[PDB]
Amino acid sequence: SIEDTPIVLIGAGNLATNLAKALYRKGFRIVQVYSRTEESARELAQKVEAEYTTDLAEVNPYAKLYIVSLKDSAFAELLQGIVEGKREEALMVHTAGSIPMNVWEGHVPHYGVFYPMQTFREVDFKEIPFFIEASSTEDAAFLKAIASTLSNRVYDADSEQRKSLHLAAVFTCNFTNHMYALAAELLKKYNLPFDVMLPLIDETARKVHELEPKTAQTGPAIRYDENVIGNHLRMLADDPAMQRLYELLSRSIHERQ
Amino acid sequence: SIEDTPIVLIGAGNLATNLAKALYRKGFRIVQVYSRTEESARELAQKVEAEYTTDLAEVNPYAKLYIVSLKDSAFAELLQGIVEGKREEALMVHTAGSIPMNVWEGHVPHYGVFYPMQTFSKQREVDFKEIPFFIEASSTEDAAFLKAIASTLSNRVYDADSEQRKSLHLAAVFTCNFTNHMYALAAELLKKYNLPFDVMLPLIDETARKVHELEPKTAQTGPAIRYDENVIGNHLRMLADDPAMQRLYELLSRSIHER
Ligand SMILES: [Cl-]
């Protein structure tokens, strides 16, 4: 029934490819693929038993869902040609999380954001989170049902919520890796190999699959053990920037008790 | 033979719970557990089929090894209550990264540090096989004894001084404690926007696995490298509700940028 949603793809890049193939494997009919270049459109279209076009005027107007994955400018330039000719029920979605849903506003009555947030080629979607925004509660439910066909992790998220993901990634990837870097600087200073940290790094990550971070939290800053922290701060005296960081991070941990 | 060593745990927290279970599974005899609170003493004793007490005066004086996992504030208070009436050959060890071995000196003839370095939680099982275990003792024969015990548990058993061990522990606070806090803040943020923390797990996994291949310095990604002042401005703007979290973001970004 849901796999009886005729689908058109506008764009034949990597994400589009993965998405189309996974949809096709799940039982979905992909009726047609569009791409800027002949090669790209044909190639993907051959992988999912679909027609292909290079011309927006030849895009099938009667599908239920249109998945646009074009880059910013290209998407931009071509929005009106994408919109042109589509019947009222056509659901118009784009896959880029950074592009507000309101681009479709005034052009089509049924639209949304269909954002699969991916970690890095071919990727199976069963653990990849999907973030859904739509022009209506029914359009959202439909896109969520489409996405749940491919993934166990499907959520409502507006632009503000989608920004919070990338803010959270900064903490989770950038700031975490920096902690590894500061550890490495210290072990370099003290002439101790860094490889000893690797089991601690792995387990720190592994642990929060099972426990909430707040519960997984350990160390001297929980009770604010000054016998430890005071001494650690002293060893960092020669790097007052790193020392401030140690202090502020420890207070931040302690403020959560 | 070495599994016949009767062991007492003085302290029943996260590290002690995990270390006790690993000893018990390897066939060691944990005779009893002491803790300041009945709930913690009992929970652990049931897991490792041991007696328990919350009174140091009731502590079994007949064991060969006493593993002490206590905060500083309980150490002094409780040191002589831990050490009196024991066998001359009993070994007293503590498990702290940043406490010198010399705490014991003058108090008991045999003593040492028995330090497994890993993040521990009671509700979470860990493979001891890959845990760095650092050993110091009052004599070579006591150190050989501790290492032999630790080697039944871990393939990574190392002799290290109090000075090396402090150094490792400082690096471990960054590596484990501050890293998990980054996860905690991300979770706080995601909750404020009605999103589950779990969406971060793939990225958490990638970030950790990356440093097996690359030096952390080489692995560093994100808008702080260039000091992308748009995204950084936008991000600071988002954290306006939380000045302390906002300042951390700024200094961490500043910090990446310098390096
Ligand atoms: Cl007592």
TrEMBL record, chain B:
It comes from the Bacteria. InterPro entries: 6-PGluconate_DH-like_C_sf (IPR008927), DUF2520 (IPR018931), NAD(P)-bd_dom_sf (IPR036291), P5C_Rdtase_cat_N (IPR028939), TM1727-like_C_sf (IPR037108). Transmembrane segments: none annotated. PANTHER family: CONSERVED HYPOTHETICAL ALANINE AND LEUCINE RICH PROTEIN. It comes from Bacteroides fragilis (strain ATCC 25285 / DSM 2151 / CCUG 4856 / JCM 11019 / LMG 10263 / NCTC 9343 / Onslow / VPI 2553 / EN-2). This is Uncharacterized protein.
